[PDB]
């Protein structure tokens, strides 16, 4: 079994610059369980990242949430970078605030 | 209150 992760990046609230919020990186539907997940602000690792909500689905694939409190600004960009055996390269998923 | 015994396979 090898299942590539789906990586979903999203805020708790619709983003308003200057207002506190939460950024989420939900990494789902993957196997084997070994994985590296890093939240990045302007290309730099965010230090205070909480890992939570680890579970598996009925087909046994893994689910896990990375999240952090943040205040969006006009200029700051955010991404989630994931390394997993299923992928040839690390995958960097950018937060799309207009999605 | 978690299961406290998982029998060996």
């Amino acid at each position: 079994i090898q299942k590539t992760p789906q990586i979903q990046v999203y805020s708790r609230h619709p983003p308003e610059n200057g207002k506190p919020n939460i950024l989420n990186c939900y990494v789902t539907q993957f196997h084997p369980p070994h994985i590296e997940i890093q939240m990045l602000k302007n290309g730099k690792k965010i230090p205070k990242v909480e890992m939570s909500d680890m579970s598996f689905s009925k087909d046994w694939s893994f689910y896990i949430l990375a999240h952090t409190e943040f205040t969006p600004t006009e200029t700051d960009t955010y991404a989630c970078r994931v390394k997993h055996d299923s992928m040839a390269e690390p995958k960097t998923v950018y937060w799309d605030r207009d999605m | 209150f978690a299961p406290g015994n998982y029998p060996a396979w």
């Binding site: 708790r12 619709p14 084997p32 939570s52 999605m99 | 299961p3 015994n5 396979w9």
Partner: protein
Amino acid sequence: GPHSLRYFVTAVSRPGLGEPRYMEVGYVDDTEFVRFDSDAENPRYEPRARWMEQEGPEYWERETQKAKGNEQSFRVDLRTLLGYYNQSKGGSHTIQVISGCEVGSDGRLLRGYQQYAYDGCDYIALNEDLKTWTAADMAALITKHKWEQAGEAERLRAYLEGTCVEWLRRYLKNGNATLLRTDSPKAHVTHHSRPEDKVTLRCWALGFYPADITLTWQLNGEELIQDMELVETRPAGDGTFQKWASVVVPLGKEQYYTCHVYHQGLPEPLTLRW
């Protein structure tokens, strides 16, 4: 409504890097409330929801002792399975277990279950009768025969029908302000251009609890379930959930499509347009 107490267990070998990674994660309904992680600096069972502060130090000590015992049993299991499947000591392998019980709004047992997997595939599972096991291959049949002669099902049944139910009731009482609340979804629709005179309409539902929700797109009273893209309902980092559902529609005809949101916090379903 109904409620569940669930424990997700995972053990992962890592040859050449020392002992397996061992984790337990407990959920009441869709909310994480306890966890154990062997990679922590001082591995202990720890609370993950605020209301678990109402348990005394004896609770955490006992859960921690169970976890360390369980950890050792899965280390042995990982070794045993190399024999069962004739696998080398060089590869990483994964055991997963889901155990739990569910009760109605009146606190009475609805069902209990335990299911195991090896390397992401069914290994063995307790049948719904809570008396017999079902095994997925020859390796699991050995395990089944062991557990039958030891009477393991009877011990497990007593936990699922008694201990599991009784503690779930206690957590629902202690965590009432969190677990029995309803947070209403807030919904909006976004719009994105595509090539070929078509448009993506995406309906968002934000800030809701509990996790169960239904999002549908409609055109003239018929649901477009087959033509929808969806994400699985997902945690938003603060104990609430979010979801989205999209449809591709002809440019200029956006006004005819409506998104419908159904949730226990919505006395009447929401209906949205672009």
